[PDB]
Amino acid sequence: METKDLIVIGGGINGAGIAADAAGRGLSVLMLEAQDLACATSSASSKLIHGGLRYLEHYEFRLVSEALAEREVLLKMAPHIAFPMRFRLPHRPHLRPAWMIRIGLFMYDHLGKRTSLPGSTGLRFGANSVLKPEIKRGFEYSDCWVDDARLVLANAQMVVRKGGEVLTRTRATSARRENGLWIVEAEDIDTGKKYSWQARGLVNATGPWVKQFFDDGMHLPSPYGIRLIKGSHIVVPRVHTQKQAYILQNEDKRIVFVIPWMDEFSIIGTTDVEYKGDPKAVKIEESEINYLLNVYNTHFKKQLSRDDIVWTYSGVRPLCDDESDSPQAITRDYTLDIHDENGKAPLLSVFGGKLTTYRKLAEHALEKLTPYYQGIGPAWTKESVLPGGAIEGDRDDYAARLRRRYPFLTESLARHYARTYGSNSELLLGNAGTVSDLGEDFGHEFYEAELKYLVDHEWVRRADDALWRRTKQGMWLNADQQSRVSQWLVEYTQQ
Numbered sequence: 152m153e154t155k156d157l158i159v160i161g162g163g164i165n166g167a168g169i170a171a172d173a174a175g176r177g178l179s180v181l182m183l184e185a186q187d188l189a190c191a192t193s194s195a196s197s198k199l200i201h202g203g204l205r206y207l208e209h210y211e212f213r214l215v216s217e218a219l220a221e222r223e224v225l226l227k228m229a230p231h232i233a234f235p236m237r238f239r240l241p242h243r244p245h246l247r248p249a250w251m252i253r254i255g256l257f258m259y260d261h262l263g264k265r266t267s268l269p270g271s272t273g274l275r276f277g278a279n280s281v282l283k284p285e286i287k288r289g290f291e292y293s294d295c296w297v298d299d300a301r302l303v304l305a306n307a308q309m310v311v312r313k314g315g316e317v318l319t320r321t322r323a324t325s326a327r328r329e330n331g332l333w334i335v336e337a338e339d340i341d342t343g344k345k346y347s348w349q350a351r352g353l354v355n356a357t358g359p360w361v362k363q364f365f366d367d368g369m370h371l372p373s374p375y376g377i378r379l380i381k382g383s384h385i386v387v388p389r390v391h392t393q394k395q396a397y398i399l400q401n402e403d404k405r406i407v408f409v410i411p412w413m414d415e416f417s418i419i420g421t422t423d424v425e426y427k428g429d430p431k432a433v434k435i436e437e438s439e440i441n442y443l444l445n446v447y448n449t450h451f452k453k454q455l456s457r458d459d460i461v462w463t464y465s466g467v468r469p470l471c472d473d474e475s476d477s478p479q480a481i482t483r484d485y486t487l488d489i490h491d492e493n494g495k496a497p498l499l500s501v502f503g504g505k506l507t508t509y510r511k512l513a514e515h516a517l518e519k520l521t522p523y524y525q526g527i528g529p530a531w532t533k534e535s536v537l538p539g540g541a542i543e544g545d546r547d548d549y550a551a552r553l554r555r556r557y558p559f560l561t562e563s564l565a566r567h568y569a570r571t572y573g574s575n576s577e578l579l580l581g582n583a584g585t586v587s588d589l590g591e592d593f594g595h596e597f598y599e600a601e602l603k604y605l606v607d608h609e610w611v612r613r614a615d616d617a618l619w620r621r622t623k624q625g626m627w628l629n630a631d632q633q634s635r636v637s638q639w640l641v642e643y644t645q646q
């Protein structure tokens with residue numbers, strides 16, 4: 152023993168969040184991630200902690216109420232990476248009558264417990280707005296932005312903090328019951344180092360891969376189909392200077408967001424495209440671009456073309472197959488399935504599960520796993536504060552506090568540290584007292600002290616883990632800057 156209580160296969164948000172909860176109820180936990188933390192669906196989201204306004208139409212009150220209540224729990228768990236945002240809904244009476252918006256916005260206000268977040272209001276649009284002349288009315292309400300990939304990272308660190316282990320670049324190849332225990336086989340994707348562990352419990356939280364892990368990894372029947380529903384986002388220099396997001400009603404009845412991103416960009420997403428194939432292959436297609444530019448350009452005065460696009464990303468939603476004919480109508484609710492064999496070796500397996508609802512999901516999963524452990528502590532995460540979160544304030548509150556303590560910090564660098572690392576910033580900065588104490592400037596104030604900290608504390612192994620997942624510095628570093636980051640990581644992860 153050697154025998155872990157629980158193996159979690161999966162390090163997106165649902166695997167990390169399950170493993171974090173388990174470790175904090177006393178279980179020995181190993182979370183296995185085939186590639187990098189959040190390398191798939193959990194870094195390809197719209198980055199919102201939202202209730203799911205559009206899901207009210209489809210009468211999804213269990214999900215929408217749970218997700219609304221979670222916005223505020225998540226704001227306190229991670230105030231370094233999560234924050235309130237306001238969403239502007241332009242009125243399109245030919246699509247949805249005002250009286251209908253007002254009922255939904257009323258429900259959005261009261262279906263979950265809502266202290267901090269303001270309520271909705273009506274809006275008018277003048278000759279001087281960002282929107283087209285003919286659009287005269289709208290609405291405004293609350294929801295939250297989160298740094299998806301950093302929420303995943305925070306949870307992995309919670310695992311380790313609480314005594315668990317987390318292996319990345321380690322692909323589970325098989326899992327089988329023997330003699331009352333799981334035998335989990337995994338393998339290092341680079342070297343080829345084989346591993347084998349026994350555990351009392353197995354979570355299959357492999358997102359879009361959940362059913363193919365049943366088929367190829369376990370030779371067991373999957374309790375559910377998964378529908379893979381691709382969505383893509385485009386990125387442009389910001390379309391306007393407003394702080395608020397816009398949520399646009401399209402002719403097909405879907406909604407599309409224009410979201411301020413990192414003070415310089417806007418994100419426009421997303422799409423619902425039925426998908427077959429390898430979830431790692433997923434990338435935006437021409438018609439997704441055409442579709443997103445269109446709904447933008449029909450609403451807004453400042454027009455965008457294709458040539459304005461600076462970045463795109465794409466991902467596949469692993470949606471519990473409710474056999475719904477239309478991809479936009481398939482449920483965004485999750486399903487968890489627990490099964491033992493002779494009252495021992497449970498298999499908990501995860502189907503669906505928005506980032507918003509992950510802490511709820513993790514909790515229910517441990518609920519179902521309780522019978523098979525001791526011994527096991529109770530629920531606890533609602534009242535936790537994830538690593539990085541111990542700041543109380545943020546928005547220079549923490550960044551100004553840091554520039555105070557570390558006066559050689561530029562205001563941009565302190566904002567970045569505060570909004571990325573939070574309360575882990577002093578750990579990064581160590582014994583630095585000047586800028587040259589930070590080491591090699593890799594570009595855009597991305598210094599060797601940040602990159603080394605990422606390797607030492609954040610499982611960074613390759614340039615992209617650092618530049619696209621733990622941060623979004625890859626938005627500013629040029630091709631040679633990025634390969635120097637890779638070159639450095641080679642030298643340091645030698646050796």
Ligand SMILES: Cc1cc2nc3c(=O)[nH]c(=O)nc-3n(C[C@H](O)[C@H](O)[C@H](O)COP(=O)(O)OP(=O)(O)OC[C@H]3O[C@@H](n4cnc5c(N)ncnc54)[C@H](O)[C@@H]3O)c2cc1C
Binds near residue numbers: 196198
């Ligand atoms: C376009 C889009 C926009 C979205 N926007 C939002 C939003 O705004 N708000 C919100 O709350 N949610 C949003 N979501 C939903 C959310 O992103 C997903 O539900 C969530 O990220 C899925 O996480 P997961 O852990 O279940 O899957 P993942 O963690 O992403 O997938 C499983 C992970 O485990 C690893 N893995 C897989 N198989 C193995 C194996 N065999 N062995 C070892 N490791 C393995 C992978 O390498 C993979 O990264 C969005 C989703 C999409 C697609």
Ligand SMILES: CCCCCCCCO[C@@H]1O[C@H](CO)[C@@H](O)[C@H](O)[C@H]1O
Binds near residue numbers: 205206207254
């Ligand atoms: C009891 C009468 C039934 C009315 C259904 C209420 C749900 C309305 O939901 C509405 O539609 C869209 C998607 O949900 C959103 O864009 C709107 O803002 C939202 O209010």
Ligand SMILES: CCCCCCCCO[C@@H]1O[C@H](CO)[C@@H](O)[C@H](O)[C@H]1O
Binds near residue numbers: 247248249250288
């Ligand atoms: C006469 C215009 C009143 C409101 C100012 C902006 C116009 C767009 O608002 C309109 O108001 C209607 C009443 O006719 C609502 O029922 C509709 O949903 C909408 O078409």
Ligand SMILES: CCCCCCCCO[C@@H]1O[C@H](CO)[C@@H](O)[C@H](O)[C@H]1O
Binds near residue numbers: 254
């Ligand atoms: C937020 C107010 C309580 C909700 C009551 C539903 C009445 C909304 O009804 C709508 O009101 C709009 C603005 O007056 C009008 O433009 C529309 O014609 C009307 O359908």
Ligand SMILES: CCCCCCCCO[C@@H]1O[C@H](CO)[C@@H](O)[C@H](O)[C@H]1O
Binds near residue numbers: 250
């Ligand atoms: C089939 C789906 C349509 C059902 C809606 C009822 C039709 C009446 O239509 C609307 O109803 C609202 C409340 O019902 C009122 O506030 C509006 O003033 C009225 O225009």
Ligand SMILES: O=S(=O)(O)CCCNC(CO)(CO)CO
Binds near residue numbers: 309311
């Ligand atoms: O700092 S934490 O303790 O929260 C996580 C530390 C992880 N360190 C690794 C360094 O090799 C990953 O970066 C692996 O244990």
Ligand SMILES: O=C(O)[C@H](CO)OP(=O)(O)O
Binds near residue numbers: 408421479
């Ligand atoms: O653009 C979006 O938000 C869509 C549907 O309009 O998807 P989802 O609900 O999965 O995030």
